[PDB]
């Protein structure tokens, strides 16, 4: 269950959603699955919202067990999109839909691709086939106001603010990744090694991080460990049951230390009330000698092709 706002019980599918400037205003909008909704509006001929009553906490995730969504405060690729940290791309005809996930009835599903993040949307009164390749009409969606089970998030992903690295570091990580995965030739169509003869696209369960360069760093053996920062992004402001504080109220509550909050908030910021968001903190990869605070980190399924020797 959520971080700010309980699941939304929306009035009409034809109402539009405002662009808010507050941090907690957006964190709430993410709780009410408003962001996935806008995406579908902006992109797929969708009418209305998604996440009815259930909200963001009630979305379906590909691996049936899914550790990171158990912590309400880890950001998904869509949640990280809604705060500008990345872009969930519109699917291209070429973008490969991994098999495994239960696409039947889904109006939006998303997965990380090797060079970015790709999500899939459906139009009015439609939902995804069981293959994922087609939206056949589902009259159980014609209300336009769909529950959170119509939203699918593939992979066990976390997204966090990233201290960005010199490309020199990235080339050196990129190289090591090829050395642990010598056999893979192309991932999601992006050249990973250079190959003569390449196999058929196969399914691929993999660890990776987004370090913010040309593509992710897939890792076989590595070490992850979490540290809590108590930062300004780690605290949310609200009036209980009335929603989140406005942008002005928020900027003030955190800088003039004159609002309320929990012990962890007061310990660092002094004392609308703002408290610590439930997450283990921020993850720090340790891979092939180096330490990196990545943008996103996760265990997804992508489409890799292999070497024919």
């Amino acid at each position: 269950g959520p971080i700010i706002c309980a699941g939304p019980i929306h009035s009409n599918k034809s109402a539009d959603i405002p662009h808010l400037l507050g941090y907690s205003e957006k964190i709430c909008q993410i709780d009410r699955l408003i962001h996935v909704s806008s995406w579908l509006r902006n992109h797929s001929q969708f009418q209305g919202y998604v996440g009815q009553r259930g909200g963001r906490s009630q979305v379906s995730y590909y691996p049936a067990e899914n550790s990171y969504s158990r912590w309400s405060g880890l950001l998904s690729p869509c949640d990280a999109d809604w705060l500008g940290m990345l872009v969930v791309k519109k699917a291209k005809g070429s973008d490969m839909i991994v098999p495994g996930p239960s696409y039947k009835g889904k109006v939006f599903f998303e997965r990380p691709t090797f060079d970015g993040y790709v999500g899939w949307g459906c139009g009015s009164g439609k939902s995804r086939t069981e293959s994922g390749e087609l939206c056949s009409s589902d009259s159980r969606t014609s209300s336009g106001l769909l529950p959170s089970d119509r939203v699918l998030w593939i992979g066990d992903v976390a997204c966090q603010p990233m201290t960005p690295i010199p490309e020199e570091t990235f080339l050196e990580l990129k190289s090591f990744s090829q050395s642990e995965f010598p056999d893979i030739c192309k991932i999601d169509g992006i050249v990973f090694n250079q190959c003569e003869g390449e196999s058929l696209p196969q399914p691929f369960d993999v660890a990776w991080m987004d370090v913010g360069h040309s593509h992710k760093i897939i890792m076989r053996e590595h070490k992850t460990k979490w540290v809590q920062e108590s930062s300004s992004k780690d605290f949310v402001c609200y009036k209980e049951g009335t929603g989140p504080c406005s942008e002005s109220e928020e900027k003030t509550c955190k800088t003039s230390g004159s609002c309320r909050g929990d012990m962890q908030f007061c310990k660092v910021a002094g004392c609308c009330r703002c408290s610590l968001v439930h997450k283990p903190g921020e993850v720090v990869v340790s891979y092939g000698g180096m330490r990196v605070r990545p943008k996103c980190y996760g265990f997804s399924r992508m489409m890799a092709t292999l070497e024919v020797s």
């Epitope: 201290t163 690295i165 010199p166 490309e167 020199e168 570091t169 080339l171 050196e172 190289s175 330490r291």
Partner: antibody, heavy 125, light 107 residues
Framework: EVKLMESGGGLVQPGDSLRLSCAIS????????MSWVRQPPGKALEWLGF??????????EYSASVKGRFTISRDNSQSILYLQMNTLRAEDSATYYC????????????????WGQGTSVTVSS | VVMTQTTSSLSASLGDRVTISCSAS??????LNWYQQKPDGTVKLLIY???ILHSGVPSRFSGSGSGTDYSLTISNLEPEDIATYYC?????????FGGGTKLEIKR
């Protein structure tokens, strides 16, 4: 006392090749990456490429400006860094420095902390 | 990435504080170094990672900055400090240097 001394520049004709070299004093050569940097006359320092250390197994990287014509290489036995300049061209003429760079991966502190004196190359017809 | 040193030359008087300013075509997330070249041609490292002083550099030197804007500051121009000052970034692949800033004395 970390010392670098470039050598081998001169006046060569376009198309010619010419090899520059950089001699090392005062520090364990195989430990450090090394970069070649050139400074066209009446211009600013251009960075050209580098050769990693023994730890990262003597890999190289090259700026787009000269990829496929130049070649950095080291000779751990003699403590010498070489820049190999093939298919030279009028734009290549400049003075060429080599410099050892300091790397602190844990913090991403990468900087060229000791420099040669420069060797001058002029490519002209 | 394209670095710009705002002023090609920069006049000053011995003893007072001087500031050379470096501006980047895009945010370089503090991966910025400062070198000083003297007329003999010699080059030395001064500051790496925006503010960290290279070994054996005097304390009157300091640099600072963020995002796309960075600056080097000598607190007492001393005659040896008369030299061209080059900044250089390492967030993106082709390490790129500024255009320099040569220091002239006011009379």
């Amino acid at each position: 006392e970390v010392k670098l001394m470039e050598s081998g520049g001169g006046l060569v004709q376009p198309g010619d090749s010419l090899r520059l070299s950089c001699a090392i004093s005062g520090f364990t050569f195989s430990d450090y990456y090394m970069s070649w940097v050139r400074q066209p006359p009446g211009k600013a320092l251009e960075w050209l490429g580098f050769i990693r250390n023994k730890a990262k197994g003597y890999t190289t990287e090259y700026s787009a400006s000269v990829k496929g014509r130049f070649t950095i290489s080291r000779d751990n036995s003699q403590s010498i860094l070489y820049l190999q300049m093939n298919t030279l061209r009028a734009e290549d003429s400049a003075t060429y420095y080599c410099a050892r760079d300091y790397r602190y991966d844990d913090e991403y502190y990468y900087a060229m902390d000791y420099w040669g004196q420069g060797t001058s190359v002029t490519v002209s017809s | 990435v394209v670095m710009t040193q705002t002023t090609s030359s920069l006049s000053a008087s011995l003893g007072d504080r001087v500031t050379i300013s470096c501006s980047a075509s895009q945010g370089i997330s503090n991966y910025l170094n400062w070198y000083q070249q003297k007329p003999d041609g010699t080059v030395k490292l001064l500051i790496y990672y925006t503010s960290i002083l290279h070994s054996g550099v005097p304390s009157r030197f300091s640099g600072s900055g963020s995002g796309t804007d960075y600056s080097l500051t000598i607190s007492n121009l001393e005659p040896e400090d008369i030299a061209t000052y080059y900044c250089q970034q390492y967030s993106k692949f082709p390490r790129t240097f500024g255009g320099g800033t040569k220091l002239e004395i006011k009379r």
